[PDB]
PDB file of C-alpha atoms in Angstrom:
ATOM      1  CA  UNK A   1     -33.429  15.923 -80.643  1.00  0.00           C
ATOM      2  CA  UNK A   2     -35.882  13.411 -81.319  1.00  0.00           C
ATOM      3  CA  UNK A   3     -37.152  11.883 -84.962  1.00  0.00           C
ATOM      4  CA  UNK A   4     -41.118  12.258 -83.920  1.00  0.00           C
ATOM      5  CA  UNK A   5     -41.347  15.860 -82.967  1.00  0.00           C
ATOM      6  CA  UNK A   6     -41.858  17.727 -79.773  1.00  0.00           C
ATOM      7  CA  UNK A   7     -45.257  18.555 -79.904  1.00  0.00           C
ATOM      8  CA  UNK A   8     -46.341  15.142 -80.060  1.00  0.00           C
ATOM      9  CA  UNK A   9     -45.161  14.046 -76.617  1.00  0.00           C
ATOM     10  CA  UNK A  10     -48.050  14.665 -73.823  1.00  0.00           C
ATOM     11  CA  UNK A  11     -50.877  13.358 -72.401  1.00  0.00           C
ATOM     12  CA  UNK A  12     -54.067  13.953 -74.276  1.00  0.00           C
ATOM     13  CA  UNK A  13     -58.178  13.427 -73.166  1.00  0.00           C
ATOM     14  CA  UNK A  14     -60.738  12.011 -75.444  1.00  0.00           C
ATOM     15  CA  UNK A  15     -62.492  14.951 -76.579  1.00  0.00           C
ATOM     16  CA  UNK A  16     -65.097  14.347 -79.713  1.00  0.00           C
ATOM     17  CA  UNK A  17     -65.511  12.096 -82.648  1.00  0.00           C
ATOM     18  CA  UNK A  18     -66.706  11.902 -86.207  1.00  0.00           C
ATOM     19  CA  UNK A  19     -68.286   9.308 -87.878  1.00  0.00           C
ATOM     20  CA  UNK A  20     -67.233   6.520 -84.939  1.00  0.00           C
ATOM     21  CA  UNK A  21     -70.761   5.202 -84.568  1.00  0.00           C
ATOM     22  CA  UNK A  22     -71.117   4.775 -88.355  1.00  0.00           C
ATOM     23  CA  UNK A  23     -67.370   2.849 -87.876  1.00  0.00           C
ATOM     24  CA  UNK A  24     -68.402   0.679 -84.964  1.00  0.00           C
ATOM     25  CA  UNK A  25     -71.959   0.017 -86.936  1.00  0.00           C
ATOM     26  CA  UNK A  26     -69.574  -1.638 -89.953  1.00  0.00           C
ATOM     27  CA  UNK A  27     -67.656  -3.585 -87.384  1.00  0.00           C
ATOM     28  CA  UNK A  28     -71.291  -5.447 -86.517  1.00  0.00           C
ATOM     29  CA  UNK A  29     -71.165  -3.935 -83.107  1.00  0.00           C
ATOM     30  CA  UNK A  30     -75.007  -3.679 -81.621  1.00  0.00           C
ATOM     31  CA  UNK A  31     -76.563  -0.212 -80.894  1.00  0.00           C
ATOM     32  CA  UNK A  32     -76.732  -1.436 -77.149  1.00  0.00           C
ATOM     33  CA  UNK A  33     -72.346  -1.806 -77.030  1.00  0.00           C
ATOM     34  CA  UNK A  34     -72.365   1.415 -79.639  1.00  0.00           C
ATOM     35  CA  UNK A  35     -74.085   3.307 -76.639  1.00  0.00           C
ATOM     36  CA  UNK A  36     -71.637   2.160 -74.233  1.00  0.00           C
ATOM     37  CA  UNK A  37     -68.229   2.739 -76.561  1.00  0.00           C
ATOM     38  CA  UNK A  38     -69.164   6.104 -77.247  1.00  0.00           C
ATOM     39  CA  UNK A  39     -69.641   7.322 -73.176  1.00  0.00           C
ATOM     40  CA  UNK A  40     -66.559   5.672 -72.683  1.00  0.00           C
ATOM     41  CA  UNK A  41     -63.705   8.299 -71.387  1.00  0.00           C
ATOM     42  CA  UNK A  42     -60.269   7.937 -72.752  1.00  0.00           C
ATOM     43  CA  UNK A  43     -56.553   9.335 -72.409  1.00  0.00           C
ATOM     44  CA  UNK A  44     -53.679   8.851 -74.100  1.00  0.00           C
ATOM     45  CA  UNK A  45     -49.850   9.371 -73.884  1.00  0.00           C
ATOM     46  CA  UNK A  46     -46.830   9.695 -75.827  1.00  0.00           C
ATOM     47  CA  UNK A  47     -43.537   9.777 -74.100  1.00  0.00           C
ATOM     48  CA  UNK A  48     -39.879   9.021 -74.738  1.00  0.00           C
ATOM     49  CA  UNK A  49     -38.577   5.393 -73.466  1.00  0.00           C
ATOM     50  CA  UNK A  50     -35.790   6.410 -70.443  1.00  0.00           C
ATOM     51  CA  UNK A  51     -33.166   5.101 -73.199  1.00  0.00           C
ATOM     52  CA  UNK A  52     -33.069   6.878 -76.590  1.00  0.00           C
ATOM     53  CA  UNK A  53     -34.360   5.521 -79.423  1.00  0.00           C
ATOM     54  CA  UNK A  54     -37.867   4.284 -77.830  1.00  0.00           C
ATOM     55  CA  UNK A  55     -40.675   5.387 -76.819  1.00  0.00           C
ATOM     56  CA  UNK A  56     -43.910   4.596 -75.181  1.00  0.00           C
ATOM     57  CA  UNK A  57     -47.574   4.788 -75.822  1.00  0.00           C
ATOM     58  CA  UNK A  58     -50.188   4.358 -73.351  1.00  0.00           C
ATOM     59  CA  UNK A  59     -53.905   3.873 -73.390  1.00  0.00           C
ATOM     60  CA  UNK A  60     -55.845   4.920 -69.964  1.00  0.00           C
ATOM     61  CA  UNK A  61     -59.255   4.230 -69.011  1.00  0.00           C
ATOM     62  CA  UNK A  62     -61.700   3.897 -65.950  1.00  0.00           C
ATOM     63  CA  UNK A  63     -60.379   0.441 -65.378  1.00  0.00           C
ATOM     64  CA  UNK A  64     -57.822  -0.351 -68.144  1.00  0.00           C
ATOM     65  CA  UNK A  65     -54.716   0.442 -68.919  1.00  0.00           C
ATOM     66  CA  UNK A  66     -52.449  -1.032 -72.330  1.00  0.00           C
ATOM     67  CA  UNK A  67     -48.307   0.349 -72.231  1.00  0.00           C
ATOM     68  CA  UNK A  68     -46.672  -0.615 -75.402  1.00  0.00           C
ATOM     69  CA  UNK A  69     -43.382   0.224 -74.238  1.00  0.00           C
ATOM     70  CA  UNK A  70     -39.752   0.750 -75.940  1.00  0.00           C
ATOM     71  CA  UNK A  71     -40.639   0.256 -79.132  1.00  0.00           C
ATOM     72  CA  UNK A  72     -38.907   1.401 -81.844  1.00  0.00           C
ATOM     73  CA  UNK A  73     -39.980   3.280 -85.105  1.00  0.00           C
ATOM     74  CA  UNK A  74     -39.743   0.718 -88.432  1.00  0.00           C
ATOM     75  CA  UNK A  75     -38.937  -2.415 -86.172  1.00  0.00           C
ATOM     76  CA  UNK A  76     -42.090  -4.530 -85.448  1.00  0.00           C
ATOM     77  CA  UNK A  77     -42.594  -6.105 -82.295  1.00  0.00           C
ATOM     78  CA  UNK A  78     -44.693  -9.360 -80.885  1.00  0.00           C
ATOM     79  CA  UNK A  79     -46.637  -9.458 -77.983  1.00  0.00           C
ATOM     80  CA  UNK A  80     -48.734 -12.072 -76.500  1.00  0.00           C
ATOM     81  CA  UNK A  81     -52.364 -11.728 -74.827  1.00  0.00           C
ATOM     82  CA  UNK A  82     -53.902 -13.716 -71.976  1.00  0.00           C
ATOM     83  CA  UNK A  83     -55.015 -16.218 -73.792  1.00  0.00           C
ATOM     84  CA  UNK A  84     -51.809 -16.868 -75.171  1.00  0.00           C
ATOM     85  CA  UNK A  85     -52.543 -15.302 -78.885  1.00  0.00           C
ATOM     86  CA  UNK A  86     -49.660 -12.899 -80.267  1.00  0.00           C
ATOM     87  CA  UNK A  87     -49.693  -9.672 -82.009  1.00  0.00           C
ATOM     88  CA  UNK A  88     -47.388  -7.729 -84.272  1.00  0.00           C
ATOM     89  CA  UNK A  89     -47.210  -4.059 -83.622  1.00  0.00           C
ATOM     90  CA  UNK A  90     -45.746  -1.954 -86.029  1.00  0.00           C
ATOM     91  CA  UNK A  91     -45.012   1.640 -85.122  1.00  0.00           C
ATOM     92  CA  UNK A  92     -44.008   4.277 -87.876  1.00  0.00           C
ATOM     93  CA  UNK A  93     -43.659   8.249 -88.420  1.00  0.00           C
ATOM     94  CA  UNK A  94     -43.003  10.043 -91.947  1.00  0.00           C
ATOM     95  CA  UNK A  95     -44.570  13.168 -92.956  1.00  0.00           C
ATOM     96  CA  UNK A  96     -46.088  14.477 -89.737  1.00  0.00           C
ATOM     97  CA  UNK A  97     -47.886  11.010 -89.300  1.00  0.00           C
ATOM     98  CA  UNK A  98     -47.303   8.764 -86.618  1.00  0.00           C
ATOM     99  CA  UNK A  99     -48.608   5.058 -87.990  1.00  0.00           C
ATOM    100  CA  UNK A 100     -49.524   2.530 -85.337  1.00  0.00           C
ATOM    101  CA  UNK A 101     -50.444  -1.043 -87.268  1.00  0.00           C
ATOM    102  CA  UNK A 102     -51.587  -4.002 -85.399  1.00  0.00           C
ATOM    103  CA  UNK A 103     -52.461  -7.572 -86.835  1.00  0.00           C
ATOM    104  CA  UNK A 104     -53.914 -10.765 -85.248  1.00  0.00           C
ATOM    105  CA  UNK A 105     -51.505 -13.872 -86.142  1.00  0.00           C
ATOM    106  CA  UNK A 106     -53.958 -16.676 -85.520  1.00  0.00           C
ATOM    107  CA  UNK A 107     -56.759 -14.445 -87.162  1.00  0.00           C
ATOM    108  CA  UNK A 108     -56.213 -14.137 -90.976  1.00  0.00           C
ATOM    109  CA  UNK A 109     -55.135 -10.680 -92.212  1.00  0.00           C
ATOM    110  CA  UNK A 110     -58.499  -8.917 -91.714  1.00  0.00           C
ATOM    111  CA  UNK A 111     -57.198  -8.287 -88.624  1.00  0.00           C
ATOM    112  CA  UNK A 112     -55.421  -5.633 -90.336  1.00  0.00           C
ATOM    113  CA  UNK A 113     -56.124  -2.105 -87.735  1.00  0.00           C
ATOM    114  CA  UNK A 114     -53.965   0.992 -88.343  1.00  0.00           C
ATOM    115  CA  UNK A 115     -54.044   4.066 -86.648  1.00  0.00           C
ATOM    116  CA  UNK A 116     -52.875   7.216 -87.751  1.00  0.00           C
ATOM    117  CA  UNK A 117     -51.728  10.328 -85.284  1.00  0.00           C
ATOM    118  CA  UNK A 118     -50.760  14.143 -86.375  1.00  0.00           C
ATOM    119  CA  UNK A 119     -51.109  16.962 -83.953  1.00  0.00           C
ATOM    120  CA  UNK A 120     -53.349  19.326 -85.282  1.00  0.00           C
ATOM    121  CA  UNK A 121     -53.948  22.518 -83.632  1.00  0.00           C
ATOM    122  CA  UNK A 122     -52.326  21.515 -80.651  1.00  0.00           C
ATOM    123  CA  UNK A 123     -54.759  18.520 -80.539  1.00  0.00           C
ATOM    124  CA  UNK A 124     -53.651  15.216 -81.038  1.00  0.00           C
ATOM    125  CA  UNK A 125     -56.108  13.733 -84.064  1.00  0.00           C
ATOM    126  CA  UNK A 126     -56.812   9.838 -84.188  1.00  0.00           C
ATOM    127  CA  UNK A 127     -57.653   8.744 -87.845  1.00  0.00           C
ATOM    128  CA  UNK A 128     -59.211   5.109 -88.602  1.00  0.00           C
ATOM    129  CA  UNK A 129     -59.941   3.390 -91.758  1.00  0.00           C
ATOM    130  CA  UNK A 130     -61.692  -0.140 -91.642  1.00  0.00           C
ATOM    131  CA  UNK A 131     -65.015  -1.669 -93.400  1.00  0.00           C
ATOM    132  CA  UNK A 132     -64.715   1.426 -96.172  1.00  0.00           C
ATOM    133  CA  UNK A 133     -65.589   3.760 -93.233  1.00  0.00           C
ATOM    134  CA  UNK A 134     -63.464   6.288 -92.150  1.00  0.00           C
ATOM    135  CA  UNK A 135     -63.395   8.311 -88.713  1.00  0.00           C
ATOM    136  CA  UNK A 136     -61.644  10.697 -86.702  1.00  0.00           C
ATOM    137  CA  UNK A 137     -61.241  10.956 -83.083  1.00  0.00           C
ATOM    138  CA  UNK A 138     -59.712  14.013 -81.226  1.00  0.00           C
ATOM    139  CA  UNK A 139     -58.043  14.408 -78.124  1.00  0.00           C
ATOM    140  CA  UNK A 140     -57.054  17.692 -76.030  1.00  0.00           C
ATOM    141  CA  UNK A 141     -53.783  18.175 -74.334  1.00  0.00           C
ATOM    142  CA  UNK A 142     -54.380  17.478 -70.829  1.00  0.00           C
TER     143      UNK A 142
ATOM    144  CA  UNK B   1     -61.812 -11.517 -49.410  1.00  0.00           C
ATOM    145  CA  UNK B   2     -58.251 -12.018 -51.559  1.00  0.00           C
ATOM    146  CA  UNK B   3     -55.799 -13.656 -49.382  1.00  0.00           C
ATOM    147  CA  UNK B   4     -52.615 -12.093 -49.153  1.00  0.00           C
ATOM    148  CA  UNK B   5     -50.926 -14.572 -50.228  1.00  0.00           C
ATOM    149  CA  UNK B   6     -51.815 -14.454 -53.747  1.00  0.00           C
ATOM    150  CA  UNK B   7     -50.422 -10.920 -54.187  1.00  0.00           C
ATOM    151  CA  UNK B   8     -47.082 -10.330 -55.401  1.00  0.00           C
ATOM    152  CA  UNK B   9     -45.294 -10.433 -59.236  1.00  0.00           C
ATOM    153  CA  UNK B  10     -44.439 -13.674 -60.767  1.00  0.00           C
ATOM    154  CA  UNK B  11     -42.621 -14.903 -63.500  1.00  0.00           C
ATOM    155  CA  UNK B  12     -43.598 -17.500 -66.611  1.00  0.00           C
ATOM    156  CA  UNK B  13     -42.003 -20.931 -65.567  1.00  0.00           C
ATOM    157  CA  UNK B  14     -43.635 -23.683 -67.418  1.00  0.00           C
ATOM    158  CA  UNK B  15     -46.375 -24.945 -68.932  1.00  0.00           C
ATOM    159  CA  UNK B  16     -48.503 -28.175 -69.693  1.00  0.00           C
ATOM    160  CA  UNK B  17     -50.642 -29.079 -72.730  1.00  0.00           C
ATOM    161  CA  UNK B  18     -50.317 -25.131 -73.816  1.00  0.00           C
ATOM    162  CA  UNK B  19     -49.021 -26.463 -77.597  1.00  0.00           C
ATOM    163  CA  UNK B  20     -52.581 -28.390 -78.286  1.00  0.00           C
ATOM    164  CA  UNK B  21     -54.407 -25.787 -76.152  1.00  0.00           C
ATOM    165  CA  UNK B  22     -52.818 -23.388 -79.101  1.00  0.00           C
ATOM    166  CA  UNK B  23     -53.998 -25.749 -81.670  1.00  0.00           C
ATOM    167  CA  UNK B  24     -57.407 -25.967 -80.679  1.00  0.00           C
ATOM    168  CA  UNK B  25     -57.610 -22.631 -81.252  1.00  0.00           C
ATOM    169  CA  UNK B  26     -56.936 -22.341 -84.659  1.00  0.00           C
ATOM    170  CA  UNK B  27     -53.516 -21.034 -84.129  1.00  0.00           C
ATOM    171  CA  UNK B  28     -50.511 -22.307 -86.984  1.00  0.00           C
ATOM    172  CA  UNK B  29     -47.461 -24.301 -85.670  1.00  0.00           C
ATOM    173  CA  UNK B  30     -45.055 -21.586 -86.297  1.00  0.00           C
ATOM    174  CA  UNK B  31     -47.020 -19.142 -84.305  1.00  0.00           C
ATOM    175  CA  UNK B  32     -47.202 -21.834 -81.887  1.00  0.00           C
ATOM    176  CA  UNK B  33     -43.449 -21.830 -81.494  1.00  0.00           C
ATOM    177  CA  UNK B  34     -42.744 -18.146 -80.612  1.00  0.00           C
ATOM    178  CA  UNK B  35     -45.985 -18.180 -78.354  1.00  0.00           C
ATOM    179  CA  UNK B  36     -44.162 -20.646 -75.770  1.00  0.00           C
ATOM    180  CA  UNK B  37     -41.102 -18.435 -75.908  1.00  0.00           C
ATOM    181  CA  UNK B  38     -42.744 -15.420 -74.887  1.00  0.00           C
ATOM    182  CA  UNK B  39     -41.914 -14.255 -71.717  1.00  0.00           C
ATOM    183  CA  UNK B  40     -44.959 -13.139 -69.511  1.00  0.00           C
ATOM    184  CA  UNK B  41     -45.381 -11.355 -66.253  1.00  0.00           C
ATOM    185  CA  UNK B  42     -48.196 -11.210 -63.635  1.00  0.00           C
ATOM    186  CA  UNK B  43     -48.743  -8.659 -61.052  1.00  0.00           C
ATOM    187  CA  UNK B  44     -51.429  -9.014 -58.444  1.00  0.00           C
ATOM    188  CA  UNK B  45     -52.063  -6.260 -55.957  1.00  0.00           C
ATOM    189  CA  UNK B  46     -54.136  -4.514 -53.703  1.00  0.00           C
ATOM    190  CA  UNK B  47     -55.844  -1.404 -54.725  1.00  0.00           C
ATOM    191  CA  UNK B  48     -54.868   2.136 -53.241  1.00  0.00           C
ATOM    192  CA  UNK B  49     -59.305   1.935 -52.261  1.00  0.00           C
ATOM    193  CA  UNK B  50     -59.617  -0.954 -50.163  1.00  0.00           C
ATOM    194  CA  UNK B  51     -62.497  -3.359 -51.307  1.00  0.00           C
ATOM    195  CA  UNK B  52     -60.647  -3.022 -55.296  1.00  0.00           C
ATOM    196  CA  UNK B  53     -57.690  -4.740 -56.562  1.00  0.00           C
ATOM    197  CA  UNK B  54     -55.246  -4.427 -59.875  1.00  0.00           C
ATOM    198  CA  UNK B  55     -53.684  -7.103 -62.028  1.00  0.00           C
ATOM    199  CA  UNK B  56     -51.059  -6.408 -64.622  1.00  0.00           C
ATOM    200  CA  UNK B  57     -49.847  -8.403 -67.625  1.00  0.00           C
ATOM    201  CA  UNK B  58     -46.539  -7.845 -68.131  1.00  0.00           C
ATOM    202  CA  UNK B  59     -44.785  -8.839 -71.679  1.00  0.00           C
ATOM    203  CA  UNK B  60     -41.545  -7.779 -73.299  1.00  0.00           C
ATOM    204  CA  UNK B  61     -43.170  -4.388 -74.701  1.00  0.00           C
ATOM    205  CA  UNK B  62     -47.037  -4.908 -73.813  1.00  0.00           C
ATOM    206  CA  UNK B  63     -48.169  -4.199 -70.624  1.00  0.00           C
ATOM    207  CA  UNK B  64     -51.996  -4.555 -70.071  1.00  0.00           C
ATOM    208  CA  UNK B  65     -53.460  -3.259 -66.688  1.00  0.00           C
ATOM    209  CA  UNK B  66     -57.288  -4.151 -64.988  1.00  0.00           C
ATOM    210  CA  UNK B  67     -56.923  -1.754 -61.897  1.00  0.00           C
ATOM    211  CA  UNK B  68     -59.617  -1.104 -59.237  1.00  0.00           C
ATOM    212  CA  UNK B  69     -62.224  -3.733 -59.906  1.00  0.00           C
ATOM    213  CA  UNK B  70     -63.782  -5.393 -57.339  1.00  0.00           C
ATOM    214  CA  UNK B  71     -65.332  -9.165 -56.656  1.00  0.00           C
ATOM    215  CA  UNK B  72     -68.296 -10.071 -58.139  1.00  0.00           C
ATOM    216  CA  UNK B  73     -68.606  -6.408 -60.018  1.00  0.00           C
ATOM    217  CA  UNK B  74     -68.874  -7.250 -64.318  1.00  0.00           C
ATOM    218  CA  UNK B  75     -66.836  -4.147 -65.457  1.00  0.00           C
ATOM    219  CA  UNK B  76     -66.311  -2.917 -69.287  1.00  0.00           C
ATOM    220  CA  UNK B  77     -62.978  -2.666 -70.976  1.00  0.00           C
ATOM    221  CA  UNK B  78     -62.834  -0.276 -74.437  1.00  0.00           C
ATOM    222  CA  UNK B  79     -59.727  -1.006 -76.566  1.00  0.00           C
ATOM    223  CA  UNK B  80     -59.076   1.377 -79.449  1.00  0.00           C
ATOM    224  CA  UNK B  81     -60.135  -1.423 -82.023  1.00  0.00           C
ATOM    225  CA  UNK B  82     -63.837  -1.120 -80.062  1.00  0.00           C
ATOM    226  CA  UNK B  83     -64.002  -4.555 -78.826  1.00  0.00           C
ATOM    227  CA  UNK B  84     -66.089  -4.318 -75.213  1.00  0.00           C
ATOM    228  CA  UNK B  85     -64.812  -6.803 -73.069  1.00  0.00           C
ATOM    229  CA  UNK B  86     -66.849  -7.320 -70.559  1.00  0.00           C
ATOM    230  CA  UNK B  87     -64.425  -8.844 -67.775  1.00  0.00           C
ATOM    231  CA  UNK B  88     -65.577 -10.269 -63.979  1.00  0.00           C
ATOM    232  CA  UNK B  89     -63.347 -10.990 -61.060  1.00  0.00           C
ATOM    233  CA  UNK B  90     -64.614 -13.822 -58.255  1.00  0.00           C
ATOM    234  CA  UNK B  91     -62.760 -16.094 -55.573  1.00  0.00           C
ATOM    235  CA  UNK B  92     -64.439 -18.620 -53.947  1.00  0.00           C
ATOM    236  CA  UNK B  93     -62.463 -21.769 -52.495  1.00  0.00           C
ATOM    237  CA  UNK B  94     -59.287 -20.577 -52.986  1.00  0.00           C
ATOM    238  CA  UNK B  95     -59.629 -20.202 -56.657  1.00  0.00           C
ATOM    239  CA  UNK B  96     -59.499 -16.738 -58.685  1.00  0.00           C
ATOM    240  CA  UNK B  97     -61.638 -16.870 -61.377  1.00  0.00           C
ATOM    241  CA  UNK B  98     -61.024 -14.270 -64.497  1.00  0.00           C
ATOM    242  CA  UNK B  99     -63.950 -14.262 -66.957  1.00  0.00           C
ATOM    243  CA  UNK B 100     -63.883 -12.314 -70.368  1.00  0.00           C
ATOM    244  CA  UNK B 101     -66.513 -12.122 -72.706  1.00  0.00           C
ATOM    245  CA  UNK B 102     -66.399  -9.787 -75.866  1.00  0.00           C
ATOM    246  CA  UNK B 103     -69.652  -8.232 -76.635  1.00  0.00           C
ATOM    247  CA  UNK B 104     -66.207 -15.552 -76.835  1.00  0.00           C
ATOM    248  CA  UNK B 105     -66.660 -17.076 -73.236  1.00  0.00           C
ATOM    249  CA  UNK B 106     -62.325 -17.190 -71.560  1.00  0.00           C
ATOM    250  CA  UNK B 107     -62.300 -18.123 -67.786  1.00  0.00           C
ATOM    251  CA  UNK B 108     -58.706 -18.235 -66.360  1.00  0.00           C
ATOM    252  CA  UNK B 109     -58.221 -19.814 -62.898  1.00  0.00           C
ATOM    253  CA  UNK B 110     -55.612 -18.820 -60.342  1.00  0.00           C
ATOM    254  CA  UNK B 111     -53.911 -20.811 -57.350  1.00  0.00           C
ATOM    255  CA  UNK B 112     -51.331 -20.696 -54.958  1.00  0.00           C
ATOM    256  CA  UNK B 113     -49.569 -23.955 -55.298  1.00  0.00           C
ATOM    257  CA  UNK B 114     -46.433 -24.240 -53.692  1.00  0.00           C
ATOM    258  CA  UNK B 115     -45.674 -20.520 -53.560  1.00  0.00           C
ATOM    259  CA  UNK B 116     -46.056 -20.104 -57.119  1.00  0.00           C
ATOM    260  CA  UNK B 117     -49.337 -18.818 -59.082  1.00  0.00           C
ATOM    261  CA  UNK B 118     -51.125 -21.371 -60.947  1.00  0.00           C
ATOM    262  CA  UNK B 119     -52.991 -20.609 -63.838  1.00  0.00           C
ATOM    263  CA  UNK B 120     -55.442 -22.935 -65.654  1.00  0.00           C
ATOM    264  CA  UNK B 121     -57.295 -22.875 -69.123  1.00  0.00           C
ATOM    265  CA  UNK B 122     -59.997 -24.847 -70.777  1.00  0.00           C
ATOM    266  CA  UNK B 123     -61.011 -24.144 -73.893  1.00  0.00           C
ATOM    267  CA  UNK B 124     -62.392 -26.292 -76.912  1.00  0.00           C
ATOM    268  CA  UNK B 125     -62.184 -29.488 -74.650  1.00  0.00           C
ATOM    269  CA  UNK B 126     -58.340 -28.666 -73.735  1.00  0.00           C
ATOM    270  CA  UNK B 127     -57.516 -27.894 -70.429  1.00  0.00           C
ATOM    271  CA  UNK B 128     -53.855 -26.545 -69.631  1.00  0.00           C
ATOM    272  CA  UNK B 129     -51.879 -25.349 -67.323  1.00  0.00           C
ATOM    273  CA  UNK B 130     -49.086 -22.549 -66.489  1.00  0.00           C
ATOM    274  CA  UNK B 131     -47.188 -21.731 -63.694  1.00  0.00           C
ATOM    275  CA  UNK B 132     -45.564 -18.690 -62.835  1.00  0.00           C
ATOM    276  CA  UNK B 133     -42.606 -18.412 -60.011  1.00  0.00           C
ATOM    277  CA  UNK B 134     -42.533 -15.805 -57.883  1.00  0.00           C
ATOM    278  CA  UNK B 135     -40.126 -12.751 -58.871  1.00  0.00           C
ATOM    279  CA  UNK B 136     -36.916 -12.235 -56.965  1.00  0.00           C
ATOM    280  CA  UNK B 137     -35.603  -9.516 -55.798  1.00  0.00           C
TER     281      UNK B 137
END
């Protein structure tokens, strides 16, 4: 078997939101690039890395696509932008909650994001907490 | 309008002035010294649609893919975070120019120099260079 369970694996389509204007509005993002952010259509995916133990995570839109790829539950990770600027990913599951936390090295810690995943009648639900606001984005199993 | 031979996956080889470039940036020397080790990958290639292309950044667990944008066509790139990044490809004189801009001004510059793809910085008065060797195989 697997630790995260089966019904979490799948590709999923960006299906409605609550309270993600309200979020982006804390962030200090403008109503013009709130507009925009909020037409935008995304997937994602959850898979299992070809050796076991991993897995992947993908984020697909209309002309981007991030693969954090064989990455392992607990263990954090580093990767490095374009710029040159590094990240550590941390990926995590207990309790029917899949944790994904990201932080900015050169940026102090208020670069702090983590997102939370459960499957929730058959949907996978995106939870976000930042700026006091929190928001919840689902997704429908493609 | 790309010529072909800028297409084609290529390795990190070296670098020059990339520590200060760091530095100018704000970023610490310890971060600095796991930045150069990084391994990074580029992938430039022709899109399925002629007229559109693809580039790929490939890293040890990070891969980060701009597919069918064309030249001279500002595009918009949504990141789960919510930072817009509004991104532009151009060539003229045998230079690829990358601009980003979140809605922080980045400009990368790519050349074919001696078979290998040649990518230059400048930022905060620092300009640096990297070159990446093309993958065998």
């Amino acid at each position: 078997a697997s630790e995260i369970p089966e019904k979490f694996f799948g590709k999923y389509d960006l299906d409605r939101s609550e309270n993600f204007d309200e979020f982006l509005a804390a962030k200090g993002v403008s109503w013009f690039v709130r507009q925009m952010i909020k037409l935008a259509k995304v997937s994602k995916v959850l898979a299992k890395n070809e050796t076991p133990g991993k897995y992947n995570m993908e984020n697909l839109t209309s002309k981007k696509n991030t693969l954090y790829h064989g990455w392992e539950l607990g263990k954090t990770f580093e990767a490095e932008g374009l710029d040159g600027v590094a990240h550590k990913i941390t990926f995590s599951f207990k309790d029917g909650v899949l944790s994904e936390h990201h932080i900015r090295l050169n940026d102090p810690e208020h670069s702090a994001e983590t997102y939370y995943y459960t499957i929730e009648n058959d949907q996978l639900v995106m939870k976000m907490v930042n700026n006091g606001i929190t928001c919840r984005r689902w997704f429908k199993r493609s």
